[PDB]
Ligand binder design. Structure first.
Ligand code: NAG
Ligand code: RUY
Length: 342
């Protein structure tokens, strides 16, 4: 169990003005810290944010949060469930800003909702420094789906925050799970348009180098992994199913020749965008998210499991014989890999 702490700075808030927070389980014998960003889509105007508030309120408010959470998968403290980092200090940051962790805007007389995702991350880091993070040697910022995109948008800002606060020895790294999307043509006919509107509605922020490349009005580009990743300085490990269910949903896919070619082309395009990503794990499965699932140890690429690949990544950051870090399936159809989730 990880225990809830609401932020002491109560001006950093969820969508409805209630305080944001984090769940923590400390491990006093460890200098490793895992901060995980929850996912859960987004909203991008008054009407569809009002709908989300009626039936997805825990993603917009802390008023109903429970006092504890069980750590699962990479957040588990049992070595049987988490071969990679079972002895680490564990942090789960709930997603209550509906802005893909990009927002910097308060609720006001002109704003019905607050969108503070980028500020929530920075405030969690600040308050944790007084609870042990000041002695860390590695801070791994991880996340799934909207939280995986949030890693890409925020990992270099966390690195800059700690450098400016006087902690240049903490190594900041990122782990992006299921947040690497393609701005491709839909099968029938979008993310690019909804994100462009959202950025304006949220006062959303993107990494500085990527912002400088694409410039004003084109910051939506930095929400797509293959465009923002080459601009990042912190080491980032990318986990991505080749046939991600959220990708197929936004593509209006729910088998004849036209759809067969569409699905095969999507897998090939995703594989191409990862060719020069040296730390990556990309199985040929139809699924969505993995790193906080209890059975995340089951899937393998080329005979290597995801917890093993992450361990090999740690060693590489001190090629290694028998301990690879770049693992991308080459077979072209969902579940051509026998270890895919059932
Ligand atoms: C609380 O957070 C806000 C928003 O980031 C910031 O402007 C303010 O300085 C913070 N207050 C303290 C005491 O850190
Ligand atoms: N980052 C993205 N680019 O396209 N679509 C994206 N996401 C879809 C899932 C929820 C988060 C946003």
């Amino acid at each position: 169990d990880l225990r809830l702490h609401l932020l002491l700075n109560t001006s950093v808030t969820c969508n409805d003005g209630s305080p944001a927070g984090y769940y923590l389980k400390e491990s006093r014998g460890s200098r490793r810290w895992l901060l995980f960003l929850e996912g859960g889509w987004y909203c991008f105007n008054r009407e569809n944010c009002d709908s989300r508030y009626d039936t997805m309120r825990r993603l917009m408010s802390s008023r109903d949060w429970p006092r504890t959470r069980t750590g699962t998968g990479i957040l588990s403290s049992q070595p049987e469930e988490n071969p990679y980092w079972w002895n680490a200090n564990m942090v789960f940051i709930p997603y209550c800003s509906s802005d893909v962790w990009s927002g910097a805007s308060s609720k006001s007389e002109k704003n019905e909702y607050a969108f503070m995702g980028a500020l929530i991350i920075q405030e969690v880091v600040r308050e944790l420094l007084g609870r042990g993070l000041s002695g860390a040697k590695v801070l791994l910022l991880a996340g799934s789906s909207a939280g995986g995109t949030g890693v890409l948008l925020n990992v270099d800002r966390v690195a800059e925050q700690l450098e400016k606060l006087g902690y240049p020895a903490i190594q900041v790294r990122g782990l992006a799970d299921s947040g690497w999307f393609l701005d491709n043509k839909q099968y029938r006919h979008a993310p690019t348009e909804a994100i462009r509107r959202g950025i304006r509605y949220w006062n959303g922020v993107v990494p500085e180098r990527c912002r400088r490349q694409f410039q004003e009005g084109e910051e939506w580009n930095c929400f797509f992994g293959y465009k923002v990743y080459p601009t990042l300085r912190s080491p980032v490990f990318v986990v991505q199913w080749l046939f991600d269910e959220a990708q197929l949903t936004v593509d209006n896919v729910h088998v004849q020749e036209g759809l067969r070619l569409y699905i095969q082309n999507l897998g090939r395009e995703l594989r191409h965008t990862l060719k020069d990503v040296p730390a990556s794990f990309a199985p040929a499965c139809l699924s969505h998210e993995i790193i906080i699932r209890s059975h995340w140890t089951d899937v393998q690429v080329k005979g290597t499991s995801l917890p093993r690949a992450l361990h090999c990544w740690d060693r590489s950051l001190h090629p290694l014989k028998g301990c690879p870090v770049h693992l991308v399936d080459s077979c072209p159809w969902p579940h051509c890999n026998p270890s895919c989730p059932t």
